[PDB]
């Protein structure tokens, strides 16, 4: 099975968590199977995804971008058109709905930049559930606007003063609050990381990306399968949501674009599968950037949503059995893609998705105009206009 009984995708995954947390993830796996056996659960979620989030998102043939590159045809899975403007809402809405079926009343999560905190707070307000988002205090001071967004949606943001007051401390604060209030609180992991069954739950809720693209590509082009799939990779939620519905279609190649930061051979990157190796972190056996003694190294990227040292266990499995390729994409390469898609197609992409766009133009030249690819446009770039404008202005006066 994938994952198997103990939560392994091949050699990777599991639930390497303390016994105090083992009770919560066991209960969560049991409640998850019961929701899969119930047809009324998936039906209510399908209708809400349709009427509230706006699914299904179109598969848009980027005609201008395709003609500009002169290579393979590029089809963009328009996840940027979701309510909230990114894919994260698929997982959070599915997990809040699961929390309602469990009889829970409180929703908690952590965030760094703020994306998962907004998606979680949105899904909680839809279901009239109390929401608490844990942030490191140093992140609260830097994200006053996202803090206002989450409070606008009715959520309470709890600043974590302990430790370094960053995302690493908010994760522990949220996990400790999850165990303490297990009888009425559900913790929503934001990506395809963490202990079993979180990678499986996040994958299935994000599989609406690939299942729609597969049927949309056929109804649109008349062909059977695209030749390649491309998605950016942080923890791996949007990539595995696009890949998994195609995993048994051997002719469809898969590419996950990693954040190479300043350069794969520099001190500031996030290329997990290019420079990392298997280790145990965040309750999962996975590839992770680490020193020779097993200490986790800091990840760097121009896009905050991709600076994670690890990667989902299912992606490490794909990388192991050579089912998917994982390519580094640099800070500057992602900036070109951000500006390119804006003026060529009129779509302002997120800095995360710009890594996929950037590699998309590379792969397009390689495959030639006789092939086709589906790129997951994970999010819109409004949250990144301020950062990009400063970066291009600072570099203008300096060069």
């Amino acid at each position: 099975q994938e994952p198997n009984k103990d939560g392994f995708y091949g050699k990777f995954g599991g639930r390497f968590v303390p016994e105090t947390l083992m009770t919560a993830v066991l209960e969560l796996e049991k409640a998850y199977r019961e929701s899969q056996a119930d047809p009324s659960f998936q039906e209510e979620l399908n209708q809400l995804l349709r009427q509230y989030v706006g699914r299904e998102t179109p598969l848009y043939y980027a005609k201008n971008l395709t003609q500009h590159i002169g290579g393979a045809k590029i089809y963009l899975k328009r996840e940027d058109l979701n309510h909230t403007g990114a894919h994260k809402i698929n997982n959070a809405l599915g997990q809040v709905w699961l929390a309602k079926r469990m009889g829970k009343k409180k929703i908690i999560a952590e965030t760094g930049a703020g994306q998962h905190g907004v998606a979680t707070a949105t899904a909680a307000a839809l279901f009239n559930m109390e929401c608490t988002i844990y942030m490191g205090e140093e992140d609260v001071k830097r994200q006053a606007l996202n803090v206002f967004r989450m409070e606008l949606l009715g959520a309470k943001v709890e600043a974590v003063t302990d430790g370094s007051r960053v995302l690493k401390d908010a994760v522990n604060a949220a996990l400790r609050s999850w165990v303490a209030n297990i009888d009425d609180t559900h913790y929503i992991l934001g990506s395809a990381l963490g202990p079993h069954p979180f990678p499986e739950i996040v994958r299935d809720f994000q599989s609406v990306i690939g299942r729609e693209a597969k049927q949309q590509y056929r109804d649109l082009t008349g062909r059977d399968l695209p030749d390649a799939l491309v998605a950016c990779v942080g923890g791996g939620s949007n990539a595995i949501g696009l890949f998994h519905p195609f995993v048994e279609d051997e002719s469809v190649a898969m590419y996950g674009t990693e954040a190479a930061g300043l350069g794969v051979d520099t001190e500031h990157h996030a290329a997990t599968l290019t420079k990392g190796r298997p280790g145990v972190l965040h309750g999962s056996l996975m590839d992770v950037l680490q020193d020779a003694h097993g200490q986790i190294l800091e990840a760097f990227s121009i896009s905050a949503g991709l600076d994670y040292p690890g990667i989902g266990p299912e992606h490490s499995h794909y990388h192991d059995i050579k089912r998917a390729s994982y390519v580094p994409v640099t800070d500057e390469e992602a900036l070109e893609g951000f500006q390119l898609l804006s003026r060529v197609e009129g779509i302002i992409p997120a800095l995360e998705s710009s890594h996929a766009i950037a590699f998309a133009v590379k792969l397009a030249k390689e495959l030639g105009p006789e092939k086709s690819m589906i790129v997951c446009l994970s999010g819109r770039g409004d949250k990144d206009v301020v950062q990009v404008k400063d970066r291009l202005e600072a570099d203008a006066a300096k060069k």
Binding site: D6, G14, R15, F16, V17, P18, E19, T20, L21, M22, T23, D162, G163, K168, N172, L175, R176, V179, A180, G279, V280, L281, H282, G283, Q290, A292, H293, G294, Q295, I296
Partner: protein, 252 residues
């Protein structure tokens, strides 16, 4: 066949004495791992039962804020599993040592390499907080026919059926942990219930900051593990020596 740690701790229990196990972070010292011998002999001369020795890890999930800071202090010196092994091979002591490490540094070093390199040391136990019962097959096979006991951790709020599943065949001692910390009367009852179905000493790893806390937990278990109070004191240059004397001398 029987592990040394089980017998040594039964002897403390037999003498009507509570088991007292200090918890220190290896490398949390002015001169890093070079201060480990000094700290151990300092605790040995106070007559403690065993010494829990921690391996610092960059992302702990089960330590309190005092121990988390001790891990950061230790990593600055460059403390690694490899260097601790080299230090432990030169440590002579009659006190049994219990390695505390999160699984990744052990996993990178190699569990078999770790066990075999520590064959003739004072290491008698092993605590891996993030290696649950469901993944014990990563370590348990390599501990067969050795003198290193895999210490199981038990959450008191769980069901007695789950707790007994974790205790089955355990050696050394049982590490009772509790979520967070009326409520305190239910802890003593859940803790005393684990003491019955258990066949080896049951040690409390909760908040022990005074002699009253120590004597409260000895009424329902076999001893305590003190970490944060000793780590904070040793680093801040605070008195702790007399607190350990009274703790060791406690007559059940």
């Amino acid at each position: 066949m029987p592990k040394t740690l089980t017998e040594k701790l039964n002897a403390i229990k037999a003498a009507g004495k509570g088991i007292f196990v200090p918890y220190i972070m290896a490398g949390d010292h002015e001169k890093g791992l070079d201060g480990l011998a000094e700290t151990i002999h300092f605790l040995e001369d106070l007559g403690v039962s065993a010494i829990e020795v921690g391996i610092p890890f960059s992302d702990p999930v089960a330590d309190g804020p005092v121990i988390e800071e001790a891990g950061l202090r230790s990593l600055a010196h460059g403390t690694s599993t490899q260097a601790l092994v080299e230090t432990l091979k030169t440590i002579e002591t009659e006190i049994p040592l219990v390695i505390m490490t999160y699984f990744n540094p052990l996993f990178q070093y190699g569990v078999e390499n770790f066990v075999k390199d520590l064959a003739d040391t004072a290491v008698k136990g092993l605590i891996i907080p993030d290696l649950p019962h469901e993944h014990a097959n990563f370590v348990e096979p390599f501990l067969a026919n050795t003198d290193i006991a895999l210490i199981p951790l038990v959450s008191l709020t769980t069901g007695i059926e789950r707790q007994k599943e974790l205790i089955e065949g355990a050696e050394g001692f049982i590490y009772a942990v509790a979520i967070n910390g009326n409520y305190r009367a239910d802890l003593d009852k859940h803790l005393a219930q684990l003491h019955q179905v258990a066949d080896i000493p049951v040690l409390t790893g909760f908040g022990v900051s005074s002699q009253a806390d120590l004597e409260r937990f000895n009424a329902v278990s076999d001893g305590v593990i003190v970490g944060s109070k000793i780590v904070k004191a040793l680093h801040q240059g605070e008195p702790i020596q007399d607190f350990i004397r009274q703790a060791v001398a406690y007559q059940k």
